[PDB]
Amino acid sequence: VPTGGDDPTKIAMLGLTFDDVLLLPAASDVLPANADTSSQLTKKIRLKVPLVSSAMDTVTEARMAIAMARAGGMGVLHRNLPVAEQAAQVETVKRSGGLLVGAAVGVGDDAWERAMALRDAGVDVLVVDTAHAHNRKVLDMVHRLKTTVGDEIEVVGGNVATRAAAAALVEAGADAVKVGVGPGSICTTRVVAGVGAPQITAILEAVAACAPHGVPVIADGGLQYSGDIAKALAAGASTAMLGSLLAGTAESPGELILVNGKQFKSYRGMGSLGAMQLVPEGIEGRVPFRGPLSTVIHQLVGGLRAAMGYTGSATIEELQQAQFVQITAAGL
Amino acid sequence: VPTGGDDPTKIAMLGLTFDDVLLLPAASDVLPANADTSSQLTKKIRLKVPLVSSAMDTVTEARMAIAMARAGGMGVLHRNLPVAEQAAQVETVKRSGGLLVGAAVGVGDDAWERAMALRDAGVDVLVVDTAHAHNRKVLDMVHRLKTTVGDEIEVVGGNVATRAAAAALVEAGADAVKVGVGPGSICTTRVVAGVGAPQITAILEAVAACAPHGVPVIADGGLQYSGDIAKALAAGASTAMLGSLLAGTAESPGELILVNGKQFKSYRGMGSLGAMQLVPEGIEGRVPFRGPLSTVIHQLVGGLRAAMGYTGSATIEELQQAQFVQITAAGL
Amino acid sequence: VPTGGDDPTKIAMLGLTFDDVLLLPAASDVLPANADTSSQLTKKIRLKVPLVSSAMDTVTEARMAIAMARAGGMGVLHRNLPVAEQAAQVETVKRSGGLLVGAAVGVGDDAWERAMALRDAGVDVLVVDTAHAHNRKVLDMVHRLKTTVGDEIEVVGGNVATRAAAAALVEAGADAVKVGVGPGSICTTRVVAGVGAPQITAILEAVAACAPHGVPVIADGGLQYSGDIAKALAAGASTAMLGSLLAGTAESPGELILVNGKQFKSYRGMGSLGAMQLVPEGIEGRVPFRGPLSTVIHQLVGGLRAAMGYTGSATIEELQQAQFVQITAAGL
Amino acid sequence: VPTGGDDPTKIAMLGLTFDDVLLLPAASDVLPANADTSSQLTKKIRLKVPLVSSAMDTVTEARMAIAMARAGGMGVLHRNLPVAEQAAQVETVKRSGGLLVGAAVGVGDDAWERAMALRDAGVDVLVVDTAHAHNRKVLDMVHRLKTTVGDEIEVVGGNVATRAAAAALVEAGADAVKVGVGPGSICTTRVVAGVGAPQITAILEAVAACAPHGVPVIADGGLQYSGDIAKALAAGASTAMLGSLLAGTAESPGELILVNGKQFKSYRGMGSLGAMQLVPEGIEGRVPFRGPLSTVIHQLVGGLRAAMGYTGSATIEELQQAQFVQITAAGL
Ligand SMILES: Cc1[nH]c(C(=O)Nc2ccc(F)cc2)c(C)c1S(=O)(=O)Nc1ccc2c[nH]nc2c1
Ligand SMILES: Cc1[nH]c(C(=O)Nc2ccc(F)cc2)c(C)c1S(=O)(=O)Nc1ccc2c[nH]nc2c1
Ligand SMILES: Cc1[nH]c(C(=O)Nc2ccc(F)cc2)c(C)c1S(=O)(=O)Nc1ccc2c[nH]nc2c1
Ligand SMILES: Cc1[nH]c(C(=O)Nc2ccc(F)cc2)c(C)c1S(=O)(=O)Nc1ccc2c[nH]nc2c1
Ligand SMILES: O=c1[nH]cnc2c1ncn2[C@@H]1O[C@H](COP(=O)(O)O)[C@@H](O)[C@H]1O
Ligand SMILES: O=c1[nH]cnc2c1ncn2[C@@H]1O[C@H](COP(=O)(O)O)[C@@H](O)[C@H]1O
Ligand SMILES: O=c1[nH]cnc2c1ncn2[C@@H]1O[C@H](COP(=O)(O)O)[C@@H](O)[C@H]1O
Ligand SMILES: O=c1[nH]cnc2c1ncn2[C@@H]1O[C@H](COP(=O)(O)O)[C@@H](O)[C@H]1O
């Protein structure tokens, strides 16, 4: 083996990230303004805009979830607060019209009760929110939830980074599979644990397991530009979950911060020291203030529509069949 | 597939850009001063110098087009102004002697009338100027133009980045094919839409479709150094179109700008916010002031001549048969 | 041969370093808190924590060796001082309870007497400490030591970077093989001599020679983050030796340094000008002050435990069978 | 072809430079102090130290040539001055004992007379000094010189970057072949002409043509560290020619320069604007002042000796058979 040892499977793959690829233009009859951006969040739920906001306490509380749903996407409420408070945020969203909402639960002691309270509150999507869903504890939770409330509530499981892990969630009964181990902007899983999978390759691998079972893949983490959304969907994801890109918006939690004459908002990992208040796997930082969510979403969707125009994709389903070119370091 | 999924065509190619390759020296009897730099702009039109200026409102108006033609190249007049004004710039050039001139048209409402006015004004080359020529609307325009004024006017179509798109323009009747989706210095197509193709690979692919039909390829965008011109032509292009490299010249539109004791001129994408005055696919910036066009062209052609000396190329046609070595990140 | 010449063996391999790979998550029933971090330092000696401190005069004297052993690892005492002083540091450690300790010897004039004095002082591990163990002088020393004190003292040999060199040390009778030629943070072997081997590939190659003989590999040098420890062990090493990561600790030798309002400690190669007081193969620098060793070790082991959780590794032996994904420049 | 077009020979090779490779350690009985550093400069001339100074007017005049010869290497006198002055510098060196000296000539009008005057002055080596020796004008000069003064004077030809060019010089009768098109520190051939060849691959290719005919290769340009000398010789070169590494020495021409409290000397390409006093293919810069040549050479040779120790090379001939590992961007 050219890279060492005698085992060709030791280094199993070459992992590509968003900056490693570009979408190739293709024959097109599609104007960007006329493209159809709708896509499956889960087997049953279709969104007008294939974007969901991260279950983080500096991204999504009731305000964000309401704005996201009104923009045609959805918010996933974070779970870093008492169960009664999360359920109360679910209610607040549902009382603002017939708006879709999801909410994160863990696999811990009180996870099952949290889930039951959220259902009672009228939640549409339950997200089993973990760093590593390839764990019998996570797969059991996913299964237990689907068998209990599956008729009324869609159950998302995550996160995974390999084909085998996505396959296990599919078998456990997941209505969607969330992909991303290591790629988050505030993530230090890669440096702390040495663990991860570049996101384009992880999406391609997860989609190979999920698509044949009609299970949508949510691409979660590592998205920096609107063009990365197009790339994630062309790799086969059906939606993208955004943290950093939305953390600087008016609707996110947290106050405005002024440093050196410029405006910021705090953005922090759920595995950072201050969020857990131990070995942190996230940092605390700031992102530029971006103004209203509606503006940000408009530019993101605008970029998506441009990609759909370039690739001749009339629908997201068509975009998922687009081709890439791999680029070198010099490209960029 | 080592990079993910089971489809080997999903990532179709490894795209190389100018910084990824060097020209290999070869046996030579050619002195740089004696090389023949002439080359086909289109099937019918040969230039003394294989360089054309970009159809941008910070690069080419009448003054640039006159200087470019006198230097042995050609200018393509931008179309960001009323039809009567563009036609008046065409006249202004033709009244400055028997100088070649081209002019951009789009595919929009008034594109056909613009084209007719330009012809009446005496234009030599019509450039169907789009970000994505692989669109039936663009191919139709190219065809409609060639069938109407083809005897008197050469019709360029662009831009493309793939072999199939170049082939479609050839069949539509293009007299030259312009290559470049994503590589412009002021371009944000890559980050906004996630779409593009590294320019050496795009030229190689387009030339594979065009050369067998005797259709010249214009390499458009991404050229930073005189050595990049040599590389573009050795990849098989017949001419290079330059924006950034000429935007800092006395003959370009726009005034001199002083910042921190240094001289600049504004240079902006035609898809930037201020040029369109929406989801911009270009930025606005500045380039260093370079002095007279004649000086810049002299150094560019000087570099080209040096490359022709190193590669034993007596003509541009010979240079198109030169070989590359691929380099690594460390090289550079 | 695509890279030049006609000999495919001239460039024998593509060497990967820690930043070139990530650990892939795998099916897991392992909680980080419950993972077993114990591992073989040598054939006979198992540590509770697979970490040893570098035999450097800015890393390990008696204080460090005591702290390291109490934390479940071990220190290797540096040999840059009189033999009687090194032996006195060995005694000092052994008088602080039943704590494991090792000590470096060279291959020079007084190396054999140093070794004998260390044994008399009660040392547990002798480390034949060289930059290049593939030297008959080093192999002879290793052999001579093992045949003389082998029943009572474990003999480590190093350093190596190739499979053949590790194999030679195994045959010489080494109880562990230390891997790393070129990767140290303060190392200039690579720039001064042009010699080295990227550490993941060197570990994989050394383990291919050592593992079939039940000889543990110590990964020495180049480790920057806790995640690198996980990667080194997954490549097949049984322990990691740390210099830079521990040089900033309270227990390391040297005083606190204040520069620009921040706290540092000096950290220098044993082959630097000031350590040898000639052609230096190390530099002198500073690392940030890190506080007590116990804190640093806790975070390092925490990262290791996280990796074991992600990879489903209940033991270090299991972690050694984990898989990597190779990443590109863009990843990082 | 994965990188574009249908011609696999269009991109002929992947070119590696010094930073792309490391020397692999090997079994060794060689102490650095005992290695034999002597090597062939030409078929007939062996140097004690395999280093020659560049024929540049900021590197080698009489003073440098004398110091270089006394250190066991040789200087090549630059040709940027009247013929009588160059010949007078040759005399000055020969009058300082039985010291070897070489001198550059071109292929121009007065090149032949320059060569004759140098011979009369007692020169030992004539270097036909060009940027591209694969030119019948250069090959003719090499041949004409060898057939005229070949019994008394060794004739070097250069520069080349390909196997075929080296082969042509061998057939022309060169006593040594100098390799390097594009790699010089002050070189802009790569950016101006887009032409070049990464130096490790160029050396490997040139040696494939020269070694079977017993013709030594001089590696010229791109050497930044003493470790690069070892790498150049292990690729198969017999000597290295140094510009930047020696330009900062007391013995080089030019005065001391003080900027921001630090000491420098000017270092400039022979193809820079100021050296030619047009399309320059070199820049003018400064390098740090390094003190006496003897110190610099000592450290360079020290690094070489270290490499010989690591690779088990008792002679330069043995070092030429050493193996490399290719490294990634992350390595470094
Ligand atoms: C550090 C951490 N561990 C867990 C976790 O769930 N651990 C766990 C997993 C399986 C299990 F059975 C029992 C516990 C979580 C949520 C976190 S987090 O707060 O930092 N959030 C994320 C989310 C997504 C990520 C992708 N890469 N890294 C990520 C971190
Ligand atoms: C953003 C944009 N879209 C179009 C465009 O023509 N859209 C379109 C295409 C086909 C069609 F049928 C209908 C409309 C244009 C001209 C532009 S531009 O002003 O920014 N100019 C260019 C030019 C070259 C480029 C290469 N990569 N990106 C480029 C942008
Ligand atoms: C520069 C140097 N040479 C030797 C050395 O032992 N030389 C030698 C080797 C075999 C022999 F038979 C006779 C002498 C040592 C210890 C050193 S050091 O002080 O700088 N330490 C290390 C340690 C680890 C390294 C990995 N890469 N580089 C390293 C340097
Ligand atoms: C720019 C230039 N051209 C020539 C030259 O000889 N031209 C030429 C060649 C063949 C011929 F028949 C007639 C003329 C030279 C010397 C130079 S230089 O002054 O700049 N020196 C070098 C030396 C080494 C180089 C490697 N890459 N680039 C280099 C430049
Ligand atoms: O603390 C953390 N460490 C690692 N990943 C996190 C952490 N907190 C949230 N994440 C994940 O990172 C995603 C956001 O990534 P981003 O959009 O690149 O900022 C989230 O949706 C989570 O999957
Ligand atoms: O706004 C824009 N976005 C992307 N490409 C543009 C834009 N405006 C002009 N271009 C293209 O970029 C070329 C100039 O590229 P440059 O020479 O690298 O500066 C032009 O000839 C166009 O093809
Ligand atoms: O001077 C030196 N030059 C090269 N390597 C050294 C030197 N001194 C110590 N080392 C090695 O570098 C290791 C520490 O590397 P680090 O943990 O990356 O700082 C040590 O354990 C030695 O193997
Ligand atoms: O002006 C120039 N342009 C390109 N190469 C040059 C020039 N002048 C000298 N050289 C070459 O660069 C070598 C020195 O390279 P360096 O050691 O990397 O600085 C010289 O020996 C020449 O071969």
CSV table of N, CA, C and O in Angstrom, one decimal, chain C residues 18 39-43 45 47 50-54 74 76 125-128 155-160 174-181 183 199 202-203 206-207 210 215-221 223 232-233 236-242 320:
chain,number,residue,atom,x,y,z
C,18,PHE,N,-0.3,13.3,10.3
C,18,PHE,CA,-1.5,13.3,11.1
C,18,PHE,C,-2.6,14.2,10.4
C,18,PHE,O,-3.8,13.8,10.4
C,39,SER,N,-2.4,0.4,27.9
C,39,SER,CA,-1.7,0.0,26.7
C,39,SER,C,-0.3,-0.4,27.0
C,39,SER,O,0.3,0.0,28.0
C,40,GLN,N,0.3,-1.3,26.2
C,40,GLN,CA,1.7,-1.7,26.3
C,40,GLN,C,2.7,-0.6,25.9
C,40,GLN,O,2.7,-0.2,24.8
C,41,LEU,N,3.5,-0.2,26.9
C,41,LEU,CA,4.7,0.6,26.6
C,41,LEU,C,5.8,-0.3,26.0
C,41,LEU,O,6.4,0.0,25.0
C,42,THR,N,6.0,-1.5,26.6
C,42,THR,CA,6.9,-2.5,26.1
C,42,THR,C,6.2,-3.8,26.2
C,42,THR,O,5.1,-3.9,26.6
C,43,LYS,N,6.9,-4.8,25.8
C,43,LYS,CA,6.3,-6.2,25.9
C,43,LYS,C,5.8,-6.5,27.3
C,43,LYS,O,4.8,-7.1,27.4
C,45,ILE,N,5.6,-4.1,30.1
C,45,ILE,CA,5.1,-3.0,30.9
C,45,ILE,C,3.8,-2.4,30.3
C,45,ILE,O,3.9,-1.9,29.1
C,47,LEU,N,0.9,0.5,30.7
C,47,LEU,CA,0.6,1.8,31.4
C,47,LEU,C,-0.9,2.0,31.4
C,47,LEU,O,-1.7,1.4,30.6
C,50,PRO,N,-1.7,5.8,27.8
C,50,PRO,CA,-0.7,5.4,26.8
C,50,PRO,C,0.2,6.6,26.4
C,50,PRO,O,0.4,6.9,25.2
C,51,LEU,N,0.8,7.3,27.4
C,51,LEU,CA,1.5,8.5,27.1
C,51,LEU,C,2.8,8.5,27.9
C,51,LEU,O,2.9,8.2,29.1
C,52,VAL,N,3.9,8.9,27.2
C,52,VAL,CA,5.2,9.0,27.9
C,52,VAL,C,5.8,10.4,27.5
C,52,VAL,O,5.5,10.9,26.5
C,53,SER,N,6.5,11.0,28.4
C,53,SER,CA,7.1,12.3,28.2
C,53,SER,C,8.5,12.2,27.6
C,53,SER,O,9.3,11.3,27.9
C,54,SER,N,8.8,13.1,26.6
C,54,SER,CA,10.1,13.1,25.9
C,54,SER,C,11.3,13.2,26.8
C,54,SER,O,11.3,14.0,27.7
C,74,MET,N,4.3,7.5,32.0
C,74,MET,CA,5.7,7.4,32.4
C,74,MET,C,6.5,8.5,31.8
C,74,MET,O,6.2,9.0,30.8
C,76,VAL,N,10.5,9.6,30.5
C,76,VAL,CA,11.8,9.1,30.2
C,76,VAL,C,12.8,10.3,30.5
C,76,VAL,O,12.8,11.3,29.8
C,125,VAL,N,12.9,1.1,32.6
C,125,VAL,CA,13.0,1.1,31.2
C,125,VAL,C,14.3,1.8,30.7
C,125,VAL,O,14.5,3.0,31.2
C,126,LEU,N,15.1,1.2,29.9
C,126,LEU,CA,16.2,1.9,29.3
C,126,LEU,C,15.8,2.3,27.8
C,126,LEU,O,15.4,1.4,27.1
C,127,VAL,N,16.0,3.6,27.5
C,127,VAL,CA,15.7,4.0,26.1
C,127,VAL,C,17.0,4.3,25.4
C,127,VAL,O,17.6,5.3,25.7
C,128,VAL,N,17.3,3.5,24.4
C,128,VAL,CA,18.5,3.8,23.5
C,128,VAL,C,18.0,4.9,22.6
C,128,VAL,O,17.3,4.7,21.6
C,155,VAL,N,14.2,-2.7,27.4
C,155,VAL,CA,15.0,-1.9,26.5
C,155,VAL,C,14.3,-1.4,25.3
C,155,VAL,O,13.8,-2.2,24.4
C,156,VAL,N,14.1,-0.1,25.2
C,156,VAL,CA,13.5,0.5,24.0
C,156,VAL,C,14.6,1.0,23.0
C,156,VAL,O,15.6,1.6,23.5
C,157,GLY,N,14.4,0.8,21.8
C,157,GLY,CA,15.3,1.3,20.7
C,157,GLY,C,14.6,2.3,19.8
C,157,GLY,O,13.4,2.1,19.5
C,158,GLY,N,15.3,3.3,19.3
C,158,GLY,CA,14.7,4.3,18.4
C,158,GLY,C,15.8,5.3,18.0
C,158,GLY,O,16.8,5.2,18.6
C,159,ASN,N,15.5,6.1,17.1
C,159,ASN,CA,14.2,6.2,16.4
C,159,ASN,C,14.3,5.6,15.0
C,159,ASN,O,15.3,5.7,14.4
C,160,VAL,N,13.2,5.1,14.5
C,160,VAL,CA,13.1,4.6,13.1
C,160,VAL,C,11.9,5.2,12.4
C,160,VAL,O,11.0,5.8,12.9
C,174,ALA,N,14.8,-5.6,20.8
C,174,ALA,CA,14.0,-4.5,21.4
C,174,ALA,C,12.7,-4.9,22.0
C,174,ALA,O,12.0,-5.7,21.4
C,175,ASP,N,12.4,-4.4,23.2
C,175,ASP,CA,11.1,-4.6,23.8
C,175,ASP,C,10.0,-3.6,23.4
C,175,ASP,O,8.9,-3.8,23.7
C,176,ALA,N,10.5,-2.6,22.7
C,176,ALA,CA,9.6,-1.6,22.1
C,176,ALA,C,10.4,-0.8,21.0
C,176,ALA,O,11.6,-0.7,21.2
C,177,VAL,N,9.7,-0.3,20.0
C,177,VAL,CA,10.4,0.4,18.9
C,177,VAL,C,9.8,1.8,18.9
C,177,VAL,O,8.6,2.0,18.8
C,178,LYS,N,10.7,2.8,18.9
C,178,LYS,CA,10.2,4.2,18.9
C,178,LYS,C,10.3,4.8,17.4
C,178,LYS,O,11.3,4.7,16.8
C,179,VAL,N,9.2,5.4,17.0
C,179,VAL,CA,9.1,5.8,15.6
C,179,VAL,C,9.0,7.3,15.5
C,179,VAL,O,8.2,8.0,16.2
C,180,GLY,N,9.8,7.9,14.6
C,180,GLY,CA,9.8,9.3,14.3
C,180,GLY,C,11.2,9.8,13.9
C,180,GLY,O,12.1,10.0,14.8
C,181,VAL,N,11.4,10.0,12.6
C,181,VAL,CA,12.6,10.7,12.1
C,181,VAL,C,12.1,11.9,11.3
C,181,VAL,O,11.4,11.7,10.3
C,183,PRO,N,9.7,14.4,12.5
C,183,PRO,CA,8.4,15.1,12.7
C,183,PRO,C,8.3,16.0,13.9
C,183,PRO,O,7.3,16.7,14.0
C,199,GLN,N,4.6,10.9,9.6
C,199,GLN,CA,4.4,10.1,10.8
C,199,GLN,C,3.3,9.0,10.7
C,199,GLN,O,3.5,7.9,11.3
C,202,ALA,N,4.9,6.3,8.6
C,202,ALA,CA,6.1,5.7,9.4
C,202,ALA,C,5.5,4.7,10.4
C,202,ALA,O,6.1,3.6,10.6
C,203,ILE,N,4.5,5.1,11.1
C,203,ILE,CA,3.9,4.2,12.1
C,203,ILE,C,3.3,3.0,11.5
C,203,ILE,O,3.5,1.9,11.9
C,206,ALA,N,6.2,0.7,10.5
C,206,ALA,CA,6.9,0.2,11.7
C,206,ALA,C,6.0,-0.9,12.3
C,206,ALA,O,6.6,-1.9,12.8
C,207,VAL,N,4.7,-0.7,12.4
C,207,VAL,CA,3.8,-1.6,13.0
C,207,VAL,C,3.7,-2.9,12.2
C,207,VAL,O,3.5,-4.0,12.7
C,210,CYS,N,6.7,-4.7,13.6
C,210,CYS,CA,6.7,-5.0,15.0
C,210,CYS,C,5.5,-5.8,15.6
C,210,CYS,O,5.7,-6.7,16.4
C,215,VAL,N,5.8,-6.7,19.5
C,215,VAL,CA,6.6,-5.6,19.9
C,215,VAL,C,5.9,-4.3,19.8
C,215,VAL,O,5.4,-4.0,18.6
C,216,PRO,N,5.7,-3.5,20.8
C,216,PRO,CA,4.9,-2.3,20.8
C,216,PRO,C,5.7,-1.2,20.1
C,216,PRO,O,6.9,-1.1,20.1
C,217,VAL,N,4.9,-0.3,19.4
C,217,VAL,CA,5.5,0.9,18.8
C,217,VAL,C,5.1,2.1,19.6
C,217,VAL,O,3.9,2.3,19.9
C,218,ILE,N,6.1,3.0,19.9
C,218,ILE,CA,5.9,4.3,20.5
C,218,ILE,C,5.9,5.3,19.5
C,218,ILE,O,7.0,5.4,18.8
C,219,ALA,N,4.9,6.1,19.3
C,219,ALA,CA,4.9,7.1,18.3
C,219,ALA,C,5.5,8.4,18.9
C,219,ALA,O,4.9,8.9,19.9
C,220,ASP,N,6.6,8.8,18.3
C,220,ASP,CA,7.4,9.9,18.9
C,220,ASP,C,7.6,11.1,18.0
C,220,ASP,O,8.3,11.1,17.0
C,221,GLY,N,6.8,12.2,18.3
C,221,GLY,CA,7.1,13.4,17.6
C,221,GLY,C,5.9,13.8,16.7
C,221,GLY,O,5.3,12.9,16.0
C,223,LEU,N,3.1,15.3,17.3
C,223,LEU,CA,1.8,15.3,17.9
C,223,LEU,C,1.4,16.7,18.4
C,223,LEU,O,2.1,17.2,19.3
C,232,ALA,N,-2.5,8.4,16.0
C,232,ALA,CA,-1.2,7.6,16.2
C,232,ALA,C,-1.5,6.2,16.6
C,232,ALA,O,-0.9,5.2,16.1
C,233,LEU,N,-2.4,6.0,17.6
C,233,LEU,CA,-2.7,4.7,18.1
C,233,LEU,C,-3.5,3.9,17.1
C,233,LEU,O,-3.3,2.7,17.0
C,236,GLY,N,-1.6,2.2,14.7
C,236,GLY,CA,-1.1,0.9,15.3
C,236,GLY,C,-0.1,1.1,16.4
C,236,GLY,O,0.4,0.1,17.0
C,237,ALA,N,0.2,2.4,16.7
C,237,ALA,CA,1.1,2.6,17.9
C,237,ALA,C,0.4,2.2,19.1
C,237,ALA,O,-0.8,2.2,19.2
C,238,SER,N,1.2,1.8,20.1
C,238,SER,CA,0.7,1.4,21.4
C,238,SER,C,0.7,2.5,22.5
C,238,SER,O,-0.1,2.6,23.4
C,239,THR,N,1.7,3.4,22.3
C,239,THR,CA,1.8,4.6,23.1
C,239,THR,C,2.3,5.8,22.3
C,239,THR,O,2.8,5.6,21.2
C,240,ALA,N,2.2,7.0,22.8
C,240,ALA,CA,2.7,8.2,22.2
C,240,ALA,C,3.6,8.9,23.1
C,240,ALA,O,3.4,9.0,24.3
C,241,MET,N,4.8,9.4,22.6
C,241,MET,CA,5.7,10.2,23.4
C,241,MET,C,5.5,11.6,23.0
C,241,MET,O,5.4,12.0,21.8
C,242,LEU,N,5.4,12.5,24.1
C,242,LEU,CA,5.1,13.9,23.9
C,242,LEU,C,6.2,14.8,24.3
C,242,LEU,O,6.6,14.7,25.5
C,320,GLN,N,-6.6,0.3,17.6
C,320,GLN,CA,-5.6,0.0,16.7
C,320,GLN,C,-6.1,-0.6,15.4
C,320,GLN,O,-5.4,-0.7,14.4
